[PDB]
Amino acid sequence: EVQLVESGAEVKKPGASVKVSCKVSGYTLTELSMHWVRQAPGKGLEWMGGFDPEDGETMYAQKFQGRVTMTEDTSTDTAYMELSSLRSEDTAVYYCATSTAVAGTPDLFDYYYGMDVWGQGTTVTVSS
Amino acid sequence: QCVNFTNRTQLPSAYTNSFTRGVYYPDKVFRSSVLHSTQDLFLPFFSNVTWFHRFDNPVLPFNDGVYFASTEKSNIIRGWIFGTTLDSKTQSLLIVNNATNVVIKVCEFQFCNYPFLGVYYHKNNKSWMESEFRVYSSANNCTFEYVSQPFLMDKNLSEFVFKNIDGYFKIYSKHTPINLVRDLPQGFSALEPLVDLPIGINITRFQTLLALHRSYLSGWTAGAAAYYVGYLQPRTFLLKYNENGTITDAVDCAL
Amino acid sequence: EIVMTQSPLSSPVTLGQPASISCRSSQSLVHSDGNTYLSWLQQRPGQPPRLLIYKISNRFSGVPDRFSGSGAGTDFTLKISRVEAEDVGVYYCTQATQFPYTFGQGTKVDIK
Ligand SMILES: *[C@@H]1O[C@H](CO)[C@@H](O[C@@H]2O[C@H](CO)[C@@H](O)[C@H](O)[C@H]2NC(C)=O)[C@H](O)[C@H]1NC(C)=O
Ligand SMILES: *[C@@H]1O[C@H](CO)[C@@H](O)[C@H](O)[C@H]1NC(C)=O
Ligand SMILES: *[C@@H]1O[C@H](CO)[C@@H](O)[C@H](O)[C@H]1NC(C)=O
Ligand SMILES: *[C@@H]1O[C@H](CO)[C@@H](O)[C@H](O)[C@H]1NC(C)=O
Ligand SMILES: *[C@@H]1O[C@H](CO)[C@@H](O)[C@H](O)[C@H]1NC(C)=O
Ligand SMILES: *[C@@H]1O[C@H](CO)[C@@H](O)[C@H](O)[C@H]1NC(C)=O
């Protein structure tokens, strides 16, 4: 069973980098399609971007393009996401979710698209 | 990445007859239509060979040499571990087979408590890979490597003989179609020499490597494999070479 | 972009009475492979959401059997048979067929 841990909550001057990390265990990071979801307080959670298991690697939202960059460290099994140019609206909780890239055995495997195991969320806060 | 498995049970083991299996070519000399008597490490005729049906793979002793046999088509059995203490204190031998080649590798392996070849899906290069970090945590000071054509291929019984004599690890093998699964077959089939490896290590124990794959529904769910293990003894055989140089019969001179 | 509408926005239900949660999709969620990749997620206060149901009706590892899913095409229902105290919180319906992945507005279920 996949288990996920997150990084610490963070504050900054606006106009700098973010490094939210998400370390998986039980399943290594190359077996997992990895997704990042933003939830604002008082609003429903919306999907920022994540892995596409076939015909490409990563897909992004249309409103987050030019900001969000996702990269995966296989050696530490850690998924990292960054986004520059922080606005005051961006203050949110950042859920890290994952799923198995395929479903089945080496005989008769089929591609799986989903949002299965969600880690806890880093609380990103833009402030003074 | 050693995977500690809970509720591990001992593998069921019965005892079967060996009949006349386990004979090999003792030298690389062609002989035609002769009766050649040789004294070597042979599996004795009609001996008790242990048949091993989440189960453990037992770390069996090596003794003077090991006859190994398997009747399976699922390709669970992928190779073997050889050594004495099977940690990073002394050297160890690892034989791993996959679909394209065989890797034989002598390093100072720190083997896992439950070693298995892990088959897992890789999304970046988009196919199922096999991880050798599931059998050992680390390999260092590695003195021998050898990559060759795989010898775990084609209902078909696969037979191996492993010896570790005067600096050389000798592997003999034979693959034969059989039509029964409960016992070892009757008839007679000599094992051709497969490889002579200039290893020069101490080997007192061995362990079979099984391939376990992810279910993608602990996480590693694969079927159990059955294999036959017998032990060679210093013993005099009389081998019958026909006109084409093939050992077609043998008599065990102590039986 | 596929938008999910979720009905009703809130649902007060007592202990043991079954409840139904409707999810409607503007686009038909059938994939090329054949599986329609819809999931029902449940979120508790102070807790990240966790997967209840994947692929319309298939139950995830460890979810209790008082959750069931049904429906097809563009019309989907989540049925809770016996409401207990552990089911309070927000429920979401999501797809995974066409990028970007989208979520419903979420419904709130309480005790009293
Ligand atoms: C089967 O085994 C061979 C031998 O280990 C693998 O081929 C090697 O793959 C590594 C990848 O890290 C390369 O660095 C080596 O150069 C390869 N060696 C050779 C001789 O090809 C192969 O990838 C394995 N195949 C599977 C499906 O596991
Ligand atoms: C050895 O073989 C004999 C012959 O059947 C059998 O009775 C005996 O139990 C076997 N012993 C062991 C230890 O396998
Ligand atoms: C796995 O990926 C590496 C790097 O992308 C590549 O070199 C290798 O060939 C891939 N494996 C196979 C079996 O093709
Ligand atoms: C072998 O590896 C060990 C660590 O595992 C190291 O202490 C030792 O120096 C190595 N032997 C060499 C480099 O000859
Ligand atoms: C070989 O290994 C055994 C088991 O550890 C040990 O008792 C024996 O002394 C070793 N022999 C040599 C020559 O190292
Ligand atoms: C030996 O070789 C000859 C000539 O190639 C062949 O006719 C015969 O079938 C072979 N086998 C035996 C058992 O004689």
Side-chain angles (χ1 to χ4, degrees), chain A residues 2 12 15 27 38 46 48 51 61 63 82 88 90 94-96 115 123 128:
Chain A
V2 192
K12 53 218 156 178
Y27 279 55
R38 183 176 66 85
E46 65 183 1
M48 314 169 63
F51 205 70
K63 67 182 290 294
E82 322 177 355
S88 301
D90 197 306
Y94 274 46
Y95 290 139
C96 173
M115 295 299 291
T123 300
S128 168

Side-chain angles (χ1 to χ4, degrees), chain A residues 46-68:
Chain A
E46 65 183 1
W47 186 73
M48 314 169 63
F51 205 70
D52 190 339
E54 61 86 20
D55 194 73
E57 271 181 21
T58 58
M59 270 316 294
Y60 287 90
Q62 279 318 93
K63 67 182 290 294
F64 282 102
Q65 184 178 2
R67 294 179 66 188
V68 175

